[PDB]
Symmetry: none
Subunit: 117 residues, 4 copies
Amino acid sequence: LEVYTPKEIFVANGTQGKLTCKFKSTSGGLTSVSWSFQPEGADTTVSFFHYSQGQVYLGNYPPFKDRISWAGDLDKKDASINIENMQFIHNGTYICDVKNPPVGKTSHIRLYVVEKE
Amino acid sequence: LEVYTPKEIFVANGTQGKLTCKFKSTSGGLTSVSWSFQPEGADTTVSFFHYSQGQVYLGNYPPFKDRISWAGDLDKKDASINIENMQFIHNGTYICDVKNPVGKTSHIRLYVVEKE
Amino acid sequence: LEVYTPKEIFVANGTQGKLTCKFKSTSGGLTSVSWSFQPEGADTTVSFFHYSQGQVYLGNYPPFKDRISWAGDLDKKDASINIENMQFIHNGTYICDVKNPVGKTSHIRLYVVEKE
Amino acid sequence: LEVYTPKEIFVANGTQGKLTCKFKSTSGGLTSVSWSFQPEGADTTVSFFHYSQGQVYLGNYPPFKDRISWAGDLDKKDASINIENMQFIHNGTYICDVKNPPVGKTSHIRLYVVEKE
């Protein structure tokens, strides 16, 4: 199992961010995706998205409320998500955790939200 | 791994349902719980709850909006959930899927009863 | 004691309707079942079926003549009945009354649908 | 609660039989009546009549089809019934089961149908 994420992305604030994850494995089925956020300059990460068995589940982290949508296809080995209307509180590191049975692999994105001016 | 669910529960409508799941295994850190609903008289199931790594994740099935809370403790081998203010649309079969390192599943037939 | 019926059922006309009742208690024996009919848009109810001690007893309500059969099992806590060849005169609310040593009641709103 | 039945009655065949039941209790609304038949020389009893909530319900026992009618009044503590056109197949023991919340008391009638000649 191999997981790719771009190292960094810059997103103009107020626009949609596309958090790309592509992975490599021998195989939908039992594979699961989880995304996590680590706010910049903080010590903690919040897991906010989980996908498995054709179902999207969301955490209750307020800054991501009504902003998160699935943009992947596990058959095409794509674990991506979109975040609407990104703002500065969304600066930080995003971490994708992919599990393909037969634990799991992770890749990090440093997301920079930029001033739209 | 072994998963238990009571075969049936009756919930007076307008009150809280307590969906009990107890499991048996040798270990809670890699353990995951999922809950599904099969509305009575349909053949679809909606997966609406997932728990792994100390985090509750919820699906967007409207009849469960703002009703679902975690009532378990994986260290105490308890994968239970609560559902607030149950109404007749919540009648059906609830399925708990627990994974330890594939899943084991147990079923509840939940009947919501007229509180009158 | 707890008594459950679905809130509603839709029965295509000319076909058999299956009136489900499931109950919860600590215990056949002295337990009894009665079913009643409230025709839509009237305020009368006719009690038309009674079950106690392995015996089905029927009332003399013409629209239910030769249509009613027991489909329960008090040991499996099932108090259901069947109604053959349901027509529009059978539209209304059905009420299951279950007694285990006063009783709880549950309601079905039964809609008979054009089979065309 | 106390329940009375006559010990025996003789009914000329082809005539109506009147199965008297009178009872004693402190109270009509929750009380129920049931009547049962034990055919002479058999070991089985068939329950064929039930009365509760102002409603008469009948069993499907063929010899009592279109023969059984309520002749009581629970307010007057009378749980009687009538049987039309009694024939020899109706010989036997009749049992009245009365229930009055606040479990029930029973009384037996040995009914002899007699040749009317």
